């Protein structure tokens, strides 16, 4: 059974990890603290790599990750689970000030851009997806995340599923990927480093999480329509994100470790994901366990209201996935 109220004892819940989830966590924390002043919530934006590692090591109570744990992670770390909190997405941003259209791009073109074989933005493979668009001769400058990143996990899972015989074979997917060192290529720290690095030089392309889409567009960056394997091209939004997630509401597993990249929904946006709390089913004492249960239950309920999630363009958990999260939260003991 879920704990609905936190312990009356003062309890500090510490979080670290996903910069995609970080801005929303900085709304969840104070509101829950404004309702329960004895509960302290701290948050850091360090990437899903650090979120998983520190949660596993027990340095924080909540590891924030856009990537589910591998079975090796669950085998190596007893009692560690990923609990879905909300649905996010990822856009591809680019620096092309002379083009007003939302350029259409897919995994095979993005893979070639990141592999260095598509060198200019007017390459015929790009024009083929955008007929009649004034593509310039500007060089393609592919940016990737330097730190271990859940965004890198999503993006390379997209490249692998759309290019299984190429990128899928090498360099594959993961929070850390051996991106090719093609001219111009740079690694940027955090989502904020991708926004600023993409805005720094015309021609840059960067995979950026949707909680940073407002900041990206305010810097004049373009926002791409991404293609799914059904052949359609989608902007990230309520409809296409809900349509893709609805394609994975039914088949969502009990442990919630599922990829929703490039889903079967023909109108589904191909880069969506669950936002995970990487937590352990044993906290240090009973009061922390109760308060952690209370905070997590609050976040998938009152914290999933649009007044929170619209500020980062996230989508709520469907009711079936809500009950699945409650089941994992209920096992949080001491």
């Amino acid at each position, epitope marked *: 059974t879920v704990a609905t109220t936190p312990a009356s004892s003062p309890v500090t819940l510490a979080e670290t990890g996903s910069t995609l989830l970080y801005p929303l966590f900085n709304l969840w924390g104070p509101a829950f603290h404004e309702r329960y002043p004895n509960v302290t919530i701290t948050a850091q934006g360090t990437g899903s790599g650090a979120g998983i590692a520190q949660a596993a090591a027990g340095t924080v109570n909540i590891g924030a990750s856009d990537a*589910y744990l591998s*079975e090796g992670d*669950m*085998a190596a770390h007893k009692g560690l689970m990923n609990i879905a909190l909300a649905i996010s997405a990822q856009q591809v941003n680019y620096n092309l000030p002379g083009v007003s259209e939302h350029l259409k791009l897919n995994g095979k073109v993005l893979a070639a851009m990141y592999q260095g074989t598509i060198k200019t933005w007017d390459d015929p493979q790009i024009a083929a997806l955008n007929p009649g668009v004034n593509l310039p001769g500007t060089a393609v400058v592919p940016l990737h995340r330097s730190d271990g990143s859940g965004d890198t996990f999503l993006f390379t*899972q997209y490249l*692998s*599923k759309q290019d*299984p*015989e190429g990128w*899928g074979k090498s360099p594959g*997917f993961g929070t850390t990927v051996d991106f090719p060192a093609v001219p111009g290529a740079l690694g940027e720290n955090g989502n904020g480093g991708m926004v600023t690095g993409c805005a720094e030089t015309p021609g840059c392309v960067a995979y950026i999480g949707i909680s940073f889409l407002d900041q990206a567009s305010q810097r004049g960056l373009g926002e791409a329509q991404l293609g799914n*394997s*059904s*052949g359609n091209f989608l902007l990230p939004d309520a409809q296409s994100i809900q349509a893709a997630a609805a*394609g994975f509401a*039914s*088949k969502t*597993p009990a442990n919630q*470790a*599922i*990829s929703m*990249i490039d889903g*079967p929904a*023909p109108d589904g946006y191909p880069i969506i994901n669950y936002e995970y709390a990487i937590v352990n089913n044993r906290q240090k004492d009973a009061a922390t366990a109760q308060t952690l249960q209370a905070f997590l239950h609050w976040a998938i309920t009152d914290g999933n209201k649009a007044s929170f999630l619209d500020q980062v363009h996230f989508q709520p958990l469907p009711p079936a996935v809500v009950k699945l999260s409650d089941a994992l939260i209920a096992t949080i003991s001491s």
Partner: antibody, heavy 125, light 110 residues
Framework: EVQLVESGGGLVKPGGSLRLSCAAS????????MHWVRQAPGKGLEWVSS????????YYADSVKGRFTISRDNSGNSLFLQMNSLRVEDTAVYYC??????????????????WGQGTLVTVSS | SVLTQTPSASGTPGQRVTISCSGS????????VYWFQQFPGAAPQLLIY???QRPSGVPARFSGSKSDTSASLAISGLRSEDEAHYYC???????????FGGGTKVTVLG
């Protein structure tokens, strides 16, 4: 090149048991959900089972659930199909097939990009 | 055979032959479709994956499409070498298993 070689087929009486093997090479074996698919002589393809590991989701067709065990030995590039309480209608060529890449442990699409030659199992008195 | 294909389809050389595969919301209506080619005596080979995607080595006259609970394989420029059985396949959410079509036997006339 990817190669899958099935073995262990033959004759079994109704109610008996038989264990099938599939030797894999040419790729990282643990990075793919592996499937079994069967085909009665002159008939269509019937999917049987799929597995990533003992710690992830394991699927069986309704026709075989409760009687078949799919398993694998990643250290030796081996997939297994142990069959129990076999029936006449289990007579088929059993194919070992490579499935989708290992993105998660829940999905099991019929992305069958490599097949073996198949081994014939005849269930008869 | 949960998915429904015509058991036999024919075409004259050079024409495009279309093989329909009708399913339901639970399988085709919610999952990627996969197409296979099988010659007498041989194992099936993957022709189309994920509705429309074509593996390397499969010629571009093989094509796929999907519409709601239905999918289609198109064989353009039909050749004598195309005489084979063709199966569609998809995951089925209700069964939590793979379902196949019964296979379409394709004869090249002439």
């Amino acid at each position: 090149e990817v190669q899958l070689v099935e073995s262990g087929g033959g004759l079994v009486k109704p109610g008996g048991s038989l264990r099938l093997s599939c030797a894999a090479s040419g790729f990282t074996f643990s990075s793919h959900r592996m499937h079994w698919v069967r085909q009665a002589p002159g008939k269509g393809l019937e999917w049987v089972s799929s597995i990533i590991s003992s710690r992830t989701y394991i699927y069986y067709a309704d026709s075989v659930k409760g009687r078949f065990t799919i398993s694998r030995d990643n250290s030796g590039n081996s997939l297994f199909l142990q069959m129990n309480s076999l029936r006449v209608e289990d007579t088929a060529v059993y194919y070992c097939a490579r499935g989708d890449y290992y993105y998660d442990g829940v999905a099991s699409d019929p992305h069958f990009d490599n097949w073996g030659q198949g081994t014939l199992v005849t269930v008869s008195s | 055979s949960v998915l429904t294909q015509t058991p036999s389809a024919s075409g004259t050389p050079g024409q495009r032959v279309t093989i329909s595969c009708s399913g339901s919301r639970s399988n085709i209506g919610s999952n990627y479709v996969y197409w296979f080619q099988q010659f007498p005596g041989a194992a099936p080979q993957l022709l189309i994956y994920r509705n429309i995607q074509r593996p390397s080595g499969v010629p571009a006259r093989f094509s796929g499409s999907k519409s709601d609970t239905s999918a289609s394989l198109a064989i353009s420029g039909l050749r004598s070498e195309d005489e084979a059985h063709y199966y569609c396949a998809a995951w089925d959410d209700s069964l939590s298993g793979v379902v196949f079509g019964g296979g379409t036997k394709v004869t090249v006339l002439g």
